[PDB]
RNA sequence: CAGCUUAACUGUGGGCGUGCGGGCGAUACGGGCAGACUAGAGUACUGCAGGGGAGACUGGAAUUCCUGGUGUAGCGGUGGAAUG
């Protein structure tokens, strides 16, 4: 397919990393997770793996004929700028980096502290 | 103080009997009765701050679920894993 500018999704977590690239509507081209490039279990959260997962979703996304893209990150961050590192010299230029994360306004209640 | 060889003991005479009742005096203090005051207290007038309470309606973020797109083979979880 032919998207000139898309936008990438960014989830970093405690014990993994997910990067989904897609169009500026919301529809995801590719995607590369940290288990998706061999990582099991705690190597997964590395941000070498989120390096790797996101160098390999960037590839994934030049095959489909994006130039350009703006990082949406998100998550307790973990491999956030290794993985804004790896986007930018996978090739692509990142437009603009927008950190939402959502926070409630109070709502819910967590779980409990452990131990 | 006196007597029995002294004492224990005994006797004699005051005190004690820490209280109660009757008469008489005092009126500072507490109290009773009759007053007076506004410094306590309460009311009024004018302002002021507040997640004080009860009722009704109503707002946004987020979690979950459902429906529909896109999209693949992992997600999640941990000290590390495994049930899922």
Same mark, same amino acid.
Not at 38 to 52: E, I, M, Y
Not at 73 to 79: A, C
């Given at each position: 397919?032919?998207? @000139?500018?898309?936008? =990438?999704?960014?989830?970093?977590? *405690?014990?993994?990393?997910? !990067? ?5 509507? %919301?529809? !995801?081209? =590719?995607? &590369? ?12 959260? +590395?941000? *070498? &793996? &989120?390096?790797? =997962? &996101?160098?390999?979703? =960037? ?11 703006? !990082?949406?990150?998100?998550? @307790? ?22 950190? !939402? +994360?959502?926070?409630?306004?109070? %709502? ?8």
């Amino acid at each position: 397919k032919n998207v @000139p500018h898309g936008a =990438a999704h960014i989830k970093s977590t *405690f014990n993994n990393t997910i !990067v989904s690239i897609t169009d500026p509507q %919301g529809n !995801v081209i =590719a995607w &590369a997770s940290s288990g998706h490039v061999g990582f099991k279990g705690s190597r997964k959260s +590395t941000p *070498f &793996a &989120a390096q790797l =997962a &996101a160098e390999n979703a =960037a590839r994934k996304a030049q095959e489909h004929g994006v130039k350009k893209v703006d !990082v949406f990150v998100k998550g @307790p961050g973990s491999g956030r700028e290794t993985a804004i590192r790896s986007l930018q010299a996978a090739g692509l230029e990142v437009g603009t980096i927008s950190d !939402v +994360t959502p926070q409630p306004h109070n %709502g819910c209640r967590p779980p409990k502290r452990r131990r």
